[PDB]
Symmetry: C2
């Protein structure tokens, strides 16, 4: 580690306009636990391949090549100054698959996904450039923010249903148990057991699911191949807008309602991510973590535009991988003896994820169980969003509102979500603004609270 950090100061970097550039070994140290974690947990990156095969009609190797593009994409946040361990807009997957499902899987569905993803890029770019992203984090009421987070969490679960199982159950419970039990103060100091688990993070739950999954017979054994992965970019190019067309203007319209809801859901992920960062920022007094919402929009905008052209992504580019981000945050809060900086954990993780792509025996090992990894990220997201959304509710008038908001955001048709927000406005103006149904004071609530 060339440049070290002064206590209470910000992590070393090179100023780069709206971005703060950090490289591994130069600006932050290389974390062995996040290395091992990314060497194994990149399977979730590979877990998109089945969706690519179904909805985009792509052969396995073309799908495998796409994940190299996304792997590069996952390192941009810690590269450009974002403490949010990136991923997909995972609670938007069901909505996005719903959209794609109305196109023939193949070139037609690829043009469709291009139109959806470039818009999502544009929405992120404008809200980030005009700094209108930061405003919304401040302006939007807490009830709505919590309604969105919870709704987004419940969407993640109508999804586990729609994408397509003892594997997933043991996977979910062990994963969620570790996640939960390692969010407490001084856990590692209490037992030798929790000390050793904390260095593996999500690995135990994932690997144990696979194991149960193999022996039980839910998924076939792998056919391990030795050597270095050889991404077929010639093939991949056939499934890019460079080869297939670009969509007619009419397609962009069909995208709009899905584009928007996919953003609203991502906005949730930003709230969840910085909720966790803000917390561990206060625990760790030795680092000054910058929380720039506009930069998260910018990086994410870049990641999507990049994807749109080079690897159209059914899960889209999202601000965080909720469980990976929570897992790193937990290890970060454990102290400098454990993790030097939030970027040393965030950065190393996906860096190792990128290299891991080239470990052909791992790629080939994970190949028959990719479905376990896909449904698991969905389940784990749903868990953390529900948990965080709930806790962020302050009184009972917020909860009364968040309930209405969550329920509408978990009905999968996005035109319908907009029809709700629309009708919600009309009802608000004619009834609520005049306070015809009264003011709502949490201390007055006698039926649902107290």
């Amino acid at each position: 580690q060339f440049i070290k950090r002064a206590h209470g100061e910000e992590q070393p970097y090179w100023p780069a306009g709206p971005f703060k550039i950090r490289l591994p070994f130069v600006h932050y140290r290389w974390e062995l636990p996040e290395m091992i974690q990314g060497f194994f947990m990149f399977v979730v990156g590979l877990a998109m391949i089945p969706l690519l095969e179904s909805y985009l009609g792509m052969p396995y190797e073309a799908a495998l090549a796409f994940t190299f593009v996304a792997g590069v994409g996952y390192i941009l946040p810690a590269l450009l100054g974002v403490p949010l361990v990136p991923g997909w807009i995972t609670p938007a997957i069901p909505v996005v698959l719903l959209y794609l499902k109305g196109f023939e899987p193949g070139p037609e569905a690829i043009r469709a996904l291009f139109a959806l993803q470039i818009e999502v890029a544009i929405i992120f770019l404008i809200l980030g450039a005009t700094r209108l992203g930061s405003k919304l984090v401040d302006v939007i009421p807490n009830s709505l923010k919590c309604g969105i987070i919870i709704g987004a969490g419940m969407a993640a679960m109508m999804g586990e249903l729609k994408i397509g199982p003892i594997s997933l159950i043991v996977g979910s419970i062990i994963s969620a148990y570790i996640l939960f039990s390692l969010s407490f103060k001084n856990v590692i100091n209490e037992n030798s057991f929790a000390r050793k688990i904390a260095n593996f993070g999500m690995v135990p739950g994932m690997i144990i699911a696979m194991l149960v999954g193999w022996t039980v017979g839910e998924y076939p054994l792998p056919d391990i191949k030795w050597g270095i992965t050889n991404p077929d970019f010639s093939l991949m190019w056939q499934y890019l807008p460079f080869t297939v067309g670009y969509p007619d203007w009419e397609i962009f319209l069909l995208a709009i309602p899905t584009a928007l809801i996919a953003y609203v859901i991502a906005f949730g992920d930003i709230l969840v991510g910085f909720t966790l960062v803000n917390r561990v920022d206060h625990i760790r007094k030795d680092e000054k973590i910058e929380e720039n919402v506009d930069r998260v929009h910018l990086v994410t905008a870049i990641r999507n535009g990049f994807h749109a052209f080079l690897a159209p992504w059914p899960g889209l580019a999202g601000p965080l991988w909720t469980a990976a981000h929570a897992t790193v945050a937990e290890r970060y809060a454990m102290g400098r003896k454990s993790m030097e900086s939030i970027y040393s954990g965030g950065g190393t993780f996906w860096m190792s994820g990128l290299l891991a792509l080239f470990a052909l025996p791992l790629v080939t090992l994970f190949k028959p169980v990719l479905p376990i990894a896909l449904s698991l990220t969905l389940v784990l997201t749903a868990y953390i969003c529900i948990m965080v959304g709930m806790e962020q509710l302050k009184n009972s008038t917020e909860r009364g509102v968040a309930g209405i908001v969550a329920v509408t955001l978990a009905m999968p048709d996005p035109k319908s979500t907009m029809y709700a927000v629309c009708i919600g406005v009309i009802l608000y103006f004619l009834i609520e603004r005049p306070r015809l149904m009264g003011k709502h004071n949490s201390e007055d609530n006698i039926i649902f609270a107290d």
Copy 2:
């Protein structure tokens, strides 16, 4: 008119009848005009089971209509037998039961299946109720699990709106949830002439506006209004009962077990929600002493289910409460003696009026083309209240972290999975949690998900 009136601070007049306390309308409690008007309209949710009967059980409309008369009599048993919980279906368990039924040929085969399932749920309610073990579970079961069940059940309910089969429903849902929310506050009716007039209609405004929008937009065909008195074709209905068709082999009862159990776990949540709301308004209303007998609720519910099994097998099953109706009565009840005399005068009047309403053929035929709005609405609204109450009932962050895991597994539609979770949860609990490996969990230690 009301023969026996209640002394202030006492329990509502009744006739002792063993485990039950018998109350008739006009004799033990007054006849509430608002709940009369409400049940004259809101009995549509009772008729909204009809499509499920047609679809999953393969029966013609009229056989299904007659079934709703059997259910209608069933809905009056709680207030008749001393249960302050406005009754209904096990609504978050509908997807699960449909999933179960979905593996049988719609028709006699599926009716035999639904019998075995409903007799089982009945037996479970009977045994837990006779052995007073229903009361035990409500006390002993940790709060985290109780809330996990409630939140779980709430989310399962929306996987149901997706699975059962729409601007109508959005308007219906938002207005209905809006009213319910805003009429849960103290002195609301004293605030505005608007809320004063709204409170006397309860769920009706949301329902009727959903129906209307539903007609005018074209999502549902116009009704074919027929004048006169409903004439339930019980001759026809008999053909689709286990009396006419067979009774299922032992093998089927075994397939039913895992679904039966989960339908109970979900009903248990509905019991918690109902008595959460009752206990609150019981303290608001100091002039009435409301007895909260959990075991009596199991008995009446057990009776209702066994009743159904033979006379009208019910895809939604017989459940401890209709969540929005119970929330609605409780709200109007909390407004004071000027509005509602007793929790039984409103709850009792409501379904009494629903039963009479079945015989109003102009309303049946009016509601017929638009039943789908009604069925989806109760699903959405149950999800809404369960989520709201489950969340609020959580006290710390360790309870919440546990409730999260539980909610997520109980909202996966396969019921065998929910048990594999409880199983794997036990195995995991015994080997890791009890030896206290992975540390203690105290909410003030929580720095990631709390503080």
